[PDB]
Amino acid sequence: EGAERDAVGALFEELVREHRVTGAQLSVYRDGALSEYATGLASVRTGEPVTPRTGFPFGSVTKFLTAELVMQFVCDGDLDLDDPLAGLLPPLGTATVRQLLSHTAGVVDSIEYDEMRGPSYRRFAAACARQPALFPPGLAFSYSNTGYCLLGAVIEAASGMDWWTAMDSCLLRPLGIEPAFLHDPRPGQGGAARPVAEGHHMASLSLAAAGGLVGSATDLVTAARPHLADRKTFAQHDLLPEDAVLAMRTCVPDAEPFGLADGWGLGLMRHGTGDGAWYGHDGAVGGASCNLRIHPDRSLALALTANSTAGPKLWEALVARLPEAGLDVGHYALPVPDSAPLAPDAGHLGTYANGDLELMVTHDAAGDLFLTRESYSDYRLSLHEDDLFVARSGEPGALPITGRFVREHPAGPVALLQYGGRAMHRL
Ligand SMILES: *C(=O)[C@H](N)CC(C)C
Ligand SMILES: [Y+3]
Ligand SMILES: [Y+3]
d(C-alpha 31, C-alpha 33), whole Å: 6
User: Could you state, in order of their start, the residue ranges of all structural domains in the chain?
Assistant: 1-333, 346-426
- Most informative mutation of 143, 262, 354, 418 for ligand 1 (most atoms within 8 A of CB): 143
Q: At 330, give phi and psi (nearest 5°).
A: -50, 155
Please count the residues of the chain.
427
CA 110 to chain CA centroid, nearest Å: 14
Q: Kindly give, in sequence order, each residue whose CB lies less than 8 Å from that of residue 379, ignoring residues fewer than 6 positions away.
A: 370, 371, 372, 391, 392, 393, 398, 400, 401
Q: Does ligand 1 come within 6 angstroms of the Cβ of 59?
A: yes
Q: What share of the chain is helix, strand, coil (3-state, %, to 5)?
A: 30, 25, 45
CB of 289 within 8 A of CB of 279? no
d(C-alpha 263, C-alpha 253), whole Å: 8
d(C-alpha 427, C-alpha 425), whole Å: 6
Q: Does ligand 1 come within 6 angstroms of the Cβ of 259?
A: no
Decide yes or no: CATH 3.40.710.10 for domain 1-333. Answer: yes
Amino acid of residue 184: D
CA of 157 to the centre of ligand 2 (A): 15
Give 37's strand partners.
26
CA of 95 to the centre of ligand 2 (A): 14
CA of 80 to the centre of ligand 2 (A): 6
Q: Does ligand 1 come within 6 angstroms of the Cβ of 284?
A: yes
CB of 8 within 8 A of CB of 325? yes
CA 121 to chain CA centroid, nearest Å: 20
CA of 84 to the centre of ligand 3 (A): 27
d(C-alpha 151, C-alpha 163), whole Å: 9
Q: Does ligand 1 come within 6 angstroms of the Cβ of 283?
A: yes
Fold classification of 346-426 is Lipocalin (2.40.128)
Q: Which atom of ligand 1 is nearest to the CA of 260?
A: 7
Method: X-ray
What are the CA-CA distances from residue 203 to residues 54, 167, 284 (Å)? Answer: 18, 18, 11
Query: Whose CA is closest to 282, among 61, 25, 27?
Result: 61
